[PDB]
Design a protein around this ligand. Structure first.
Ligand code: E5E
Length: 138
């Protein structure tokens, strides 16, 4: 698959450092994970073909303190957004307090990198959704 993960036990790898280790990402048997409380960073990588309709990456990450989001196209970082529960504000309209990232329609594929860290268990679910899913989030 293209929904891949990477465990950073040092927690020091950055976006450049992670893009220098693309061959260490490994396929996920499912679209979620959970890890007991540790100071490890969990990096998710998603390669998508060219998109034809407006869509969003949804991530329900309860108890997740820091979450950094990076988007890669033509070897460039087009978007770089840092948020998280430990991050303040970031208010958005989902009762769930879930996360959504718009996925562009620009005639090129894309690679997503997401870093998650916490002092609690690293529960997380994620998927790509269209408008049929967007209108039903809570
Ligand atoms: N849709 C995102 C939502 O506003 C939000 C904001 C900050 C958070 O720490 C979070 O989990 C969710």
């Amino acid at each position: 698959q293209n929904w891949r993960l990477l465990r950073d036990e040092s927690a020091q790898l950055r976006i450049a450092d992670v893009l220098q280790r693309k061959e260490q990402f490994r396929p996920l048997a499912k679209r979620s994970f959970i890890f007991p409380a540790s100071p490890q960073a969990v990096w998710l990588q998603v390669q998508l073909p060219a998109q034809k309709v407006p869509s969003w990456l949804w991530i329900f990450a309860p108890r997740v303190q820091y979450l950094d989001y990076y988007l890669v196209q033509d070897g460039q970082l087009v978007r770089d957004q840092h948020t998280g529960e430990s991050r303040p504000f970031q208010e958005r309209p989902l009762p769930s307090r879930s996360y959504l990232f718009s996925l562009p329609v620009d005639g090129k594929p894309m690679t997503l990198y997401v870093r998650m860290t916490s002092n609690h268990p690293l529960m997380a679910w994620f998927d790509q959704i269209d408008e049929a899913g967007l209108v039903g989030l809570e």
